[PDB]
Amino acid sequence: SIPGVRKVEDVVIYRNEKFHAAFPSVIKKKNGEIVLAFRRAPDRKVFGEKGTNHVDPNSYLVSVKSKDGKTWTPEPELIYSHPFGGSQDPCLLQLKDGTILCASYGWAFLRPDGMENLKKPYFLAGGAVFLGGYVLRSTDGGKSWQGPLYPPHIEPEINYTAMGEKLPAYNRGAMYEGKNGRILWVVAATDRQSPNKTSNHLLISDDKGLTWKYSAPVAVDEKVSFNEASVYETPKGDVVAFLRTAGLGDQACIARSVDGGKTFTAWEKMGFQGHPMHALRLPDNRVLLSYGYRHKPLGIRARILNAECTDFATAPEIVLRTDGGTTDLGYPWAVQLDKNRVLVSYYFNVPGGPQHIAGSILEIR
C-alpha cells in the first residue's frame, strides 16, 4: 500500500460498440470544464471485417467533456477531420493563458498509380502512407480550432509524406510549458530505414506553438528505437523526457537536460516495463508518471516521483487496472480534478468488448 494514494473508482468515459476509441489526452480549463480528446474511427466489425488496426481514412479527432471527471457528455464533438486522410493520437496542451494546442499526425490512403509515384523514402503501414504531424490551435477555449500548422521537418527524419513533402515532425506525448513560457516538445524521427529506427529530439516554441525550432537530440542509439515521449520541466529547471522504446524489452527510459534543453545526458533505463508515459505535476510538486502495461496482467500502472524525477527506481508502482482483454489499450493521460483528486484517463478493452475511453479516479493527499 502506497502512502497517500488510493483509487476512488474506475469510470467509463466514452464507449460505443460501432467505434474504436483510443489514445486520449485531457485538460481542465480555468472555467472548470474538463476536455478530453481522443481518436475515433469505425470498429471495422461494422463492415464485417475480422478486426481493427490503427489506420483508417475516417479516424477523426473528437472530444467529450465533464465537470467532475465522472459524468461525461454522451456525443463526441469534432475537433478535426483532416482533408487528406485519417488523424491520430490527439495530444492537448493548455497554456497558462488558456491557449490550447492539439498535436496530431496522419495517414493517407493512396491508389496504385499514387503508390507507384511516391518519392522515397516513405513509411507504409497497414496499406497507408504516413503524413507526419500537424497541430491545431484554439484561443477560444476549444470552441473553434485554427490550423493545421505543420511542424518543421527535422534533419534526422528521412521520410517524405504521402504528398511528397519532407515529413513534418510529430509524436504522441505531452508537451510542457516551461516557466519562462517556452513550449517544450519531444518529437520522434525515423533516422534509419532498414531496419526501421527512430530517435527523439527536442523542439522548442517561443511563440506559443506557432513555430518550432530544433534544440537538441534527446535519445539516440545504434540499435534501440525511441518514439513516444512525454516531456517535463522540474521546479529546479531540469528538462526530463520519459521515453517508450523498441528493441529494449519494453523498458521505459528517461533522458535529462540540465542546461535548459541545449544538450541531453545519456538516456537511462528507469528499471521497469511500460509505455507510453505521461507526467503530471501534483499539488505538492511530486510527479505522477502513468503508463500502459501491455503484459500480463494487461492494464494501467503509475508511480509518483519526487519533484526532480530522480527516484523512479525506488518509487512504488501503483496498479490501476489488471482486467484488460487484448494489448490494444493504454496510453494513459492524467489531469488534476481538484487539490486531492486526479483522473488518470486511458483507453481500454475488456474481453469481448470494444476499444473505449476509461479512467481511474485517484485520491492523492
Added chain:
Amino acid sequence: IPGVRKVEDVVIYRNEKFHAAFPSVIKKKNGEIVLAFRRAPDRKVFGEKGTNHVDPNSYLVSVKSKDGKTWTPEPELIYSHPFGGSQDPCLLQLKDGTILCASYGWAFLRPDGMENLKKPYFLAGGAVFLGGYVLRSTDGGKSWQGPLYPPHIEPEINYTAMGEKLPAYNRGAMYEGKNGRILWVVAATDRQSPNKTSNHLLISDDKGLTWKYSAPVAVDEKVSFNEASVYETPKGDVVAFLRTAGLGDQACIARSVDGGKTFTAWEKMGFQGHPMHALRLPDNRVLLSYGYRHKPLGIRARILNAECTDFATAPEIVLRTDGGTTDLGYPWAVQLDKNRVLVSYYFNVPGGPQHIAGSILEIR
C-alpha cells in the same frame, strides 16, 4: 430571353488541392447566404492520374456571403461522416428557419469485408454505397444534429456496406409545401442488372424528423430516373424535375394533382440537361437551372410559368459555354434581391480544377 441579363460570373471557392463540387445554397432571414458543397482531395496531390466522385475524406463544407459576389475564403465544416465519404449536400431552409442538409455516403472496405457483404449492394469506384442521411440545424447552421437516416423504401433492393436495408437519398431540392409538409423525391435502385433507378415521393409532417412513403413518381421498364428536384406550384400541383439514364440525357417532368398521392405519366420536356433545380421567382415564375454536359459544355436555364407547364416553349438561357470536361454542373439558384438571382454550380475550364462558381442573373 426578354428581360433576363447575365450580370456577371463569380468564383465562389477554388483551390487546386481540392475537388469542389455539387453545391446547394440558401439565404437566411438575416441576409447571410450559405452555400454547402462537397470537398475532397484532388487526387493529383497524391500523384494519381485523376479524381472521381468517391473518396473516404469527402466532407460537407460551406462558404458564406452577404451579396453573392465575395465569399469567405476558408470553408467551414458541416459534416464529416464517421463511416466514409459524403456527397452532394442538399440544403432546405424551412420558413421557421430550421435547415435540413441531406447527403449520402460511400464506405471503403477491406477484402475480407467485401467477401462477407450481404447482397445486393452497390459498388462504384471501389466503394460500397451507404445511402442517405440528413443533418438538421435549429440554430441557423451554427451546429448540426443527426444524422437522421431516411427510411428504406420498398422499391430499393440494396443493402448498405454495414448490412442494413439502404436508407433513401437523392441529389435535388426538397420543398416545403404551403401547409408545412416537406416534399422529397428520392431515388431507389429497383433492378440490379442492368442497373435501373426510379423516383418516389417521401413526405415529412414533423419538419424532417420522420418520413412517410407517399407515391411512386417516375418508373419505367427501361429508363432510369435518379436525381430529382421537387416543387409545389401556387395552385398546389407537385412537380418533379428528373434526370434520366437510358433516354439520351432527356430532362423529364412528372406531376401530381392530388397533393402527392398519385403522379401522372412522366414526360420529356424536350431538351437535354441535368440535374435540375427549380426556384420560385418573386412573380411566381419558376427558374429551372441545369447543367449542360454536351458541346459546348456549361450551364443553362429556362424560366417557366407559375404552374410549370410551358417548358416546351420557354426559351433557353445559356449561362456558360467554357467548360473543360463534363465534370461540372449541378446548378442551384438563390434569390439575391427582387430581380437578381445567383445561379451557383461547380465548374472546370481546360487545365483547371473543379471549383464552385456562379452566374448572377438580372430577371425583370
